[PDB]
Amino acid sequence: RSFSEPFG
Amino acid sequence: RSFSEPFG
Amino acid sequence: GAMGSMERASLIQKAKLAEQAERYEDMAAFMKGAVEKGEELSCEERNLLSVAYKNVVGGQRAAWRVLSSIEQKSNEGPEVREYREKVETELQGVCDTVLGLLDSHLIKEAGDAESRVFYLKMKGDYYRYLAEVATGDDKKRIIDSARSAYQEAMDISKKEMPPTNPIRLGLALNFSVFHYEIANSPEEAISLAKTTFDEAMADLHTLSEDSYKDSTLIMQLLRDNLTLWT
Amino acid sequence: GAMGSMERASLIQKAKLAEQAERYEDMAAFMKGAVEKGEELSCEERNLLSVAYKNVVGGQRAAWRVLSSIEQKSNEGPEVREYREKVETELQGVCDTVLGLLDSHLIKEAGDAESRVFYLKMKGDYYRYLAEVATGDDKKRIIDSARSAYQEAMDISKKEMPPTNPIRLGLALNFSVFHYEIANSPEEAISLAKTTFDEAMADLHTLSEDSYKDSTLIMQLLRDNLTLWT
Ligand SMILES: [Ca+2]
Ligand SMILES: [Ca+2]
Ligand SMILES: [Ca+2]
Ligand SMILES: [Ca+2]
Ligand SMILES: [Cl-]
Ligand SMILES: [Cl-]
Ligand SMILES: [Mg+2]
Ligand SMILES: [Mg+2]
Ligand SMILES: [Mg+2]
Ligand SMILES: [Mg+2]
């Protein structure tokens, strides 16, 4: 898995 | 607040 | 019920999968379906029922506390009250669902001390959660229902279980919280926590290493509360 | 919709309360209701919409991954597959709901670069989440839909926004994840992450301290992925 934009 | 039995 | 067509064993299996996936609403629906098959629950199944509903109502209680705090600060439009009321009504509905399962017919069929105490403790807990949000005359009646369930559970547990039994310990813990946080009886809470802790301490010598670990985990919470309360 | 009788401003207020209470399903329902009022969304409102649905689908994706892992280990009764399928269908339904809002009619009405890029990035993200669970020919079409949305967003962002714009950065981040995890194009992912990072670095000097903080937070994720990927 990779890091995507944080959920917020 | 106080500690009750953990949810599990 | 929507679970009426699923096998009891399949509902239990799916409740365990839902727990692993942290899908607690699903877990509660599966366990409600299992209860509604009409057979008694084993020890493991009772714990699945409790884990499911404690996590569901626990999230609701946390949300209600956030909203109640915002509402009270706003009291130092109607939207905050309306939304707090929405969450409160949903919380009350879940508590009523659990209480209905206990009344139809888990408690009446529970003859062994371990099952009967477990269910009566649950009844006390869910009335306590109702009491946390109740206001007025209904609050008094809800408080008495919680107290009555906890007291019956205590009476059975003291006659039928050793002082280190984890169900007995968790019952005493939660009843002490009821006294401190709900019933405005902090001295009763402290006395119950102290006596419970000391009587468990004196029984630890009878336990295997694994049971010792189970009992001391709950005893630590009694001590943690005593530290908060004294 | 069940939110049709509530004022737009009340739905926005309640979405903010739901966020504070960590009630993300409620938050998403309130923001869906706000979108369905038919007016465009402000910057803050777009972020509320995105926070709500990212948290809802994020929980579903985490649960689906747990169940998929259990199912694959069991492939080394039907209950694990059935329950994974249930969660998958619910996930697909939420993605379809978001995509439907974007298609009716958020994207078509979005004329400014900031809004249009934001919505096209959302469209790419929710097709990407569909792709994570898709199998076969429909997977190919879903992948192309994600790619097409991300590409249109990239084209606009490169013409209309500075390289440090947080929407542009988050778009490039998520498109790089699409390349690495979905499209089997790790070299494209690495190249996009590197070029994005370097072009943002060269533009940091133009930013205030607060914008600098916003941009560097996302640049750190590009670097974190490059460390995982190389
Ligand atoms: Ca019986
Ligand atoms: Ca005293
Ligand atoms: Ca327009
Ligand atoms: Ca290479
Ligand atoms: Cl409401
Ligand atoms: Cl299922
Ligand atoms: Mg059967
Ligand atoms: Mg009320
Ligand atoms: Mg209006
Ligand atoms: Mg499927």
Numbering used by the authors:
A (entry chain P), B (entry chain P): 29 to 35, 391
C (entry chain A), D (entry chain A): -4 to 71, 78 to 231
Sentences from the study reporting this entry:
The 14-3-3σ protein, which has multiple interacting partners with specific peptidic motifs, was used as a case study. We have observed this phenomenon first-hand with human 14-3-3σ, a protein which has several hundred known interacting partners in the cell. For example, the 14-3-3σ isoform (but not other isoforms) specifically targets p53 and is associated with tumour suppression, making it invaluable to determine crystal structures of the target peptide with the correct isoform.
To address this problem, we present a combined co-crystallization and peptide-soaking approach to obtain crystals for any 14-3-3σ–peptide complex that may exhibit difficulties when crystallizing under our optimized ‘sigma’ conditions. The second step involves, after these 14-3-3σ–cJun-pS227 crystals are fully grown, displacement of the c-Jun peptide via addition of the desired peptide for the final structure at high concentration to the crystal drop and incubation for a period of time until full occupancy of the peptide is achieved. We have found useful criteria to be using the peptide at >95% purity and performing the soaking at 277 K with an incubation time of one week. To demonstrate the experimental reliability of the method, we considered this approach for peptides found in the PDB where co-crystal structures were published with isoforms of 14-3-3 other than the sigma isoform, since they were not able to crystallize under the standard ‘sigma’ conditions or any of the other hundreds of screening conditions tested. Not only does this significantly reduce the production time, but new 14-3-3–peptide structures that were previously not accessible with the 14-3-3σ isoform, despite screening hundreds of other different conditions, were now also able to be resolved. All models were determined to belong to the orthorhombic space group C2221 using Zanuda. In addition, the method retains the robust, stable, high-resolution and well diffracting features of crystals originally grown in the sigma screen.
